[PDB]
Amino acid sequence: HWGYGKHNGPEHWHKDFPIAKGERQSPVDIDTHTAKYDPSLKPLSVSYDQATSLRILNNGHAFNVEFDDSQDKAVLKGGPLDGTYRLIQFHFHWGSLDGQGSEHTVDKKKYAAELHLVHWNTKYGDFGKAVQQPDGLAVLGIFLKVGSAKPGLQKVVDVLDSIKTKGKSADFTNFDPRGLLPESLDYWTYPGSLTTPPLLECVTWIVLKEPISVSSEQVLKFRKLNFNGEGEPEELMVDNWRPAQPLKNRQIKASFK
Ligand SMILES: Clc1cccc(OCc2nn[n-]n2)c1
Numbered sequence: 001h002w003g004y005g006k007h008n009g010p011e012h013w014h015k016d017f018p019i020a021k022g023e024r025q026s027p028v029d030i031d032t033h034t035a036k037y038d039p040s041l042k043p044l045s046v047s048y049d050q051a052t053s054l055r056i057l058n059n060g061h062a063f064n065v066e067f068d069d070s071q072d073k074a075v076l077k078g079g080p081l082d083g084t085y086r087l088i089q090f091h092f093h094w095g096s097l098d099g100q101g102s103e104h105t106v107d108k109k110k111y112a113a114e115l116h117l118v119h120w121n122t123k124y125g126d127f128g129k130a131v132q133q134p135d136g137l138a139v140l141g142i143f144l145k146v147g148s149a150k151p152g153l154q155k156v157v158d159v160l161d162s163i164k165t166k167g168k169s170a171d172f173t174n175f176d177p178r179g180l181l182p183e184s185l186d187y188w189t190y191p192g193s194l195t196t197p198p199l200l201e202c203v204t205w206i207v208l209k210e211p212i213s214v215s216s217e218q219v220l221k222f223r224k225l226n227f228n229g230e231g232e233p234e235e236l237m238v239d240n241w242r243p244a245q246p247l248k249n250r251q252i253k254a255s256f257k
């Protein structure tokens, strides 16, 4: 029964998931004047040409777009990563108002939303094994600012009224996640965790510097989803983000100068 409310939100998670107060929790604030350019980072390789999307699901916390990860069809390699990471799903975190919603912040700036493309290290064979390893996942994070519409998001926005409530799903084939990326792949990277329970410390975070722009109409539609199931009282799916956690003994590295 974790969630994002006053009574079951981020401040309560540690009682069921004590790793909530661990040494490598996410998200963090990215202090752009303390991050250091690392000339050793190899270039980032986002290979989504063969991506096979399947389904979109409201899981009561966000909506997830799921991919076929039974072969190397959509992979992330390079940058800080060793080996090959398979795209399994993406989802977003967003706010009730345009001034909040992202999980990562940039010099304490909150964006309206944040997209997470989740990938797992194929040397571990399956997702459930990968999340038990310190290098099991790579999450590519992309900020959303409100401005011009993002055409490659509109197929997502248009389907949300079919999955309004928890447990609803819809076919979501033939969706190209390349349409969600910004132009630049400049990024920050640091070792961290899942940002929801179980909060496992298994993620290499790769957060793109360049946000994408979405329209106020597009993000407004995110906010019409529901955390509740059908035939329950309505609780709008807004503010499904965890705030910044202590950086502790970690360094955030920049791919760019
Ligand atoms: Cl939605 C989208 C966005 C950006 C690039 C895309 O395809 C690029 C490509 N890959 N192979 N030929 N063109 C597709």
Ligand SMILES: Clc1cccc(OCc2nn[n-]n2)c1
Binding pocket: 088, 089, 091, 116, 118, 139, 193, 194, 195, 196
């Ligand atoms: Cl497949 C998956 C597994 C666990 C958590 C997920 O989404 C929330 C999250 N964790 N880190 N960034 N977002 C997604």
Ligand SMILES: [Zn+2]
Binding pocket: 091, 092, 093, 116, 195
């Ligand atoms: Zn996420």
